[PDB]
C-alpha cells in the first residue's frame, strides 16, 4: 504494498508537474 502504490502515485504527481513546467 500500500505504501509503494501510494508512493508511486505520489511521485507520479511530481513527474507530471515537472512536465507542465517544461511545456
Measure the CA–CA gap between 1 and 22, rounded to whole angstroms. Answer: 32
Measure the CA–CA gap between 5 and 7, rounded to whole angstroms. Answer: 5
Measure the CA–CA gap between 17 and 13, rounded to whole angstroms. Answer: 6
Which residue carries 504494498 as its cell? 1
8-17-9 Cα angle (round to 5) = 15
C-alpha pair distances (Å), 17 with each of 6, 7, 9: 17, 15, 12
Phi, psi of 13 (to 5 degrees): -60, -35
Experiment used for this model: NMR
Measure the CA–CA gap between 19 and 16, rounded to whole angstroms. Answer: 5
Amino acid at each position: 504494498q500500500i505504501a509503494i502504490v501510494a508512493l508511486v502515485v505520489a511521485i507520479i504527481i511530481h513527474i507530471v508537474v515537472w512536465s507542465i513546467v517544461i511545456i
